[PDB]
Design an enzyme around this catalytic site. Structure first.
Site, PDB file in Angstrom:
ATOM      1  N   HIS A 133       0.887  -0.874   0.261  1.00  0.00           N
ATOM      2  CA  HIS A 133       0.060   0.046   0.335  1.00  0.00           C
ATOM      3  C   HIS A 133       1.065   1.271  -0.111  1.00  0.00           C
ATOM      4  CE1 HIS A 133      -3.798  -2.368   0.058  1.00  0.00           C
ATOM      5  NE2 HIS A 133      -3.275  -2.698   1.712  1.00  0.00           N
ATOM      6  N   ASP A 171      -3.149 -11.387  -1.951  1.00  0.00           N
ATOM      7  CA  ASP A 171      -2.996 -10.259  -1.177  1.00  0.00           C
ATOM      8  C   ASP A 171      -4.323 -10.015  -0.774  1.00  0.00           C
ATOM      9  OD1 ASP A 171      -3.344  -7.626   0.580  1.00  0.00           O
ATOM     10  OD2 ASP A 171      -1.443  -8.876   1.660  1.00  0.00           O
ATOM     11  N   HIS A 173      -5.949  -7.661  -0.995  1.00  0.00           N
ATOM     12  CA  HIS A 173      -6.421  -6.425  -0.804  1.00  0.00           C
ATOM     13  C   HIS A 173      -5.235  -5.661  -2.114  1.00  0.00           C
ATOM     14  CE1 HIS A 173      -7.045  -6.135   3.470  1.00  0.00           C
ATOM     15  NE2 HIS A 173      -7.705  -5.691   3.545  1.00  0.00           N
ATOM     16  N   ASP A 264      -3.912 -12.815   3.813  1.00  0.00           N
ATOM     17  CA  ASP A 264      -5.070 -13.075   4.471  1.00  0.00           C
ATOM     18  C   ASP A 264      -6.267 -12.377   3.360  1.00  0.00           C
ATOM     19  OD1 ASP A 264      -4.276 -11.079   2.129  1.00  0.00           O
ATOM     20  OD2 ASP A 264      -4.033  -8.812   4.134  1.00  0.00           O
ATOM     21  N   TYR A 304      -3.638 -11.536   9.386  1.00  0.00           N
ATOM     22  CA  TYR A 304      -3.629 -11.723  10.194  1.00  0.00           C
ATOM     23  C   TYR A 304      -3.843 -12.445  11.176  1.00  0.00           C
ATOM     24  CZ  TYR A 304      -2.834  -7.021   7.925  1.00  0.00           C
ATOM     25  OH  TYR A 304      -2.026  -6.519   7.296  1.00  0.00           O
TER      26      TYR A 304
HETATM   27  C1  LIG Z   1      -7.435  -3.353  10.957  1.00  0.00           C
HETATM   28  S1  LIG Z   1      -8.562  -2.445   9.952  1.00  0.00           S
HETATM   29  O1  LIG Z   1      -9.598  -1.993   9.893  1.00  0.00           O
HETATM   30  O2  LIG Z   1      -9.053  -1.049  10.173  1.00  0.00           O
HETATM   31  N1  LIG Z   1      -8.452  -1.590   8.355  1.00  0.00           N
HETATM   32  C2  LIG Z   1      -6.827  -1.175   8.128  1.00  0.00           C
HETATM   33  C3  LIG Z   1      -5.890  -2.405   7.240  1.00  0.00           C
HETATM   34  C4  LIG Z   1      -5.133  -1.687   6.283  1.00  0.00           C
HETATM   35  C5  LIG Z   1      -4.204  -2.506   5.663  1.00  0.00           C
HETATM   36  C6  LIG Z   1      -4.299  -4.411   5.232  1.00  0.00           C
HETATM   37  C7  LIG Z   1      -3.793  -4.970   4.801  1.00  0.00           C
HETATM   38  O3  LIG Z   1      -3.345  -5.752   4.868  1.00  0.00           O
HETATM   39  N2  LIG Z   1      -3.452  -4.742   3.240  1.00  0.00           N
HETATM   40  O4  LIG Z   1      -2.790  -5.386   2.055  1.00  0.00           O
HETATM   41  C8  LIG Z   1      -5.790  -4.434   6.775  1.00  0.00           C
HETATM   42  C9  LIG Z   1      -6.507  -3.331   6.883  1.00  0.00           C
HETATM   43  C10 LIG Z   1      -9.559  -1.633   7.365  1.00  0.00           C
HETATM   44  C11 LIG Z   1      -9.586  -2.467   6.940  1.00  0.00           C
HETATM   45  C12 LIG Z   1     -11.258  -3.254   7.004  1.00  0.00           C
HETATM   46  C13 LIG Z   1     -11.149  -3.693   6.305  1.00  0.00           C
HETATM   47  C14 LIG Z   1     -10.829  -5.073   5.719  1.00  0.00           C
HETATM   48  N3  LIG Z   1     -10.086  -4.429   5.372  1.00  0.00           N
HETATM   49  C15 LIG Z   1      -9.032  -3.352   5.856  1.00  0.00           C
HETATM   50  K   LIG Z   2      -3.861  -8.561  -4.201  1.00  0.00           K
HETATM   51 ZN   LIG Z   3      -3.618  -6.771   2.964  1.00  0.00          ZN
END
Ligand SMILES: CS(=O)(=O)N(Cc1ccc(C(=O)NO)cc1)Cc1cccnc1
Ligand SMILES: [K+]
Ligand SMILES: [Zn+2]
Ligand SMILES: [K+]
Length: 357
Positions: A133, A171, A173, A264, A304
């Protein structure tokens, strides 16, 4: 036939002093490392040392202002650290965070160097904080510097500028930082699979949609596979690899493969909501090993559930070591929206990749 492994306990020092139960835990990396030992995988690998990235290396991808701000946090008081962290989307900072991010990047540089000089065939990097990110000018989503992007540029710096690097980001995300860093670059092919939900899933940007194919000379070299409306798992990921990831990657013919290997999307993750199994990640790894003469570096991103990530990443290392893939479950019919997603990417990238026609 040698697999490298980098892990350094010093990367555990980055921590959240106000929310000690924050999911991006120091023990993410120690748990993965412990599971490699439990499974007797660690002694089968050649240990590659960690090192600090240099500021000049950071400048391969990041602005001097951003480097200087994160660097300055090493000497900040807790008040400065809290307020600085709040300037970003989803960042916590401690006095050790900068050094830990440097070690994550330098560890991957050493691993890429070992691959590119023939010291090892492939490698795994058990590192934190994550990277994908992180943008040129800012931190985001637990990431300070873009380890995978920096590693691609480092690889080019020790070989030739045009070295073809494939980054596959599994990942859950979207790696917004990696996409943006390479958006106008045809030497680094970025392929991301990610939960999208019509832009409602973090990082909450339509930049992650399938119609973002890159810009300028990089048109066609950014492949987003976005998932909507469904608990995706092994069947959907296997199908995306069969129809999209592998045909495009083979046509690109990378000379080095980097995996932004967040875990994740795994069954059990508290955030991803998906159900990719450890055997699923093993099959994805095994398929990628058929590219670039096997020169693959697996870089930890997110993930996580400590048990899930430990089993999942260990299974990937087992594949790098040459073990046969474990058997997948019976692949159920794909979620209807997954077929829609795959067809949308096929239509978006048919102008650029003859393997999709
Ligand atoms: C912990 S959080 O809920 O506040 N979150 C922050 C967050 C930022 C980055 C990553 C990651 O793994 N990136 O690759 C994971 C979490 C928002 C969120 C909400 C729902 C789903 N995913 C993220
Ligand atoms: K990805
Ligand atoms: Zn992620
Ligand atoms: K690109």
């Amino acid at each position: 036939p040698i697999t490298g492994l980098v892990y350094d306990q010093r990367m555990m020092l980055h921590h959240n002093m106000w929310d000690s139960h924050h999911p991006e835990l120091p023990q993410r990396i120690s748990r993965i490392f412990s599971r490699h030992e439990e499974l007797r995988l660690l002694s089968r690998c050649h240990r590659i040392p960690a090192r600090l990235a240099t500021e000049e290396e950071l400048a391969l991808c990041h602005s001097s202002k951003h480097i200087s701000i994160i660097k300055s946090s090493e000497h900040m008081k807790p008040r400065d650290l809290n307020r600085l962290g709040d300037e970003y989307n989803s960042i916590f900072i401690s006095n050790e965070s900068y050094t830990c991010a440097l070690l994550a990047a330098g560890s991957c540089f050493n691993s890429a160097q070992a691959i590119l000089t023939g010291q090892v065939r492939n490698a795994v990097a058990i590192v934190r904080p994550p990277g994908h990110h992180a943008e040129k000018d800012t931190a985001c989503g637990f990431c300070f510097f873009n380890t995978a992007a920096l590693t691609a540029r480092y690889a080019q710096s020790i070989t030739r500028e045009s070295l073809r690097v494939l980054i596959v980001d599994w990942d859950v995300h979207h790696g917004n930082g990696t996409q943006h860093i390479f958006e106008e670059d045809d030497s680094v092919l970025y392929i991301s699979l990610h939960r999208y939900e019509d832009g409602a899933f973090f990082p909450n940007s339509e930049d992650a949609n399938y119609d973002k194919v890159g810009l300028g000379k990089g048109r066609g070299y950014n492949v987003n596979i976005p998932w909507n409306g469904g608990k995706m798992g092994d069947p959907e990921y296997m199908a995306a690899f069969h129809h999209l990831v592998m045909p495009i990657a083979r046509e690109f013919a990378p000379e080095l493969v980097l995996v932004s290997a967040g875990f994740d999307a795994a069954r059990g993750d508290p955030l991803g909501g998906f159900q990719v199994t450890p055997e699923g990640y093993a099959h994805l790894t095994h398929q990628l090993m058929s590219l670039a003469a096997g020169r693959v570096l697996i870089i930890l991103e997110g993930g996580y559930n400590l048990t899930s990530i430990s089993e999942s990443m260990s299974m990937c290392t087992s594949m790098l070591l040459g073990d046969s893939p474990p058997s997948l479950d019976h692949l159920t019919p794909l979620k209807t929206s997954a077929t829609v997603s795959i067809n949308n990417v096929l239509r978006a990238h048919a102008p650029f990749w003859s393997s999709l026609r």
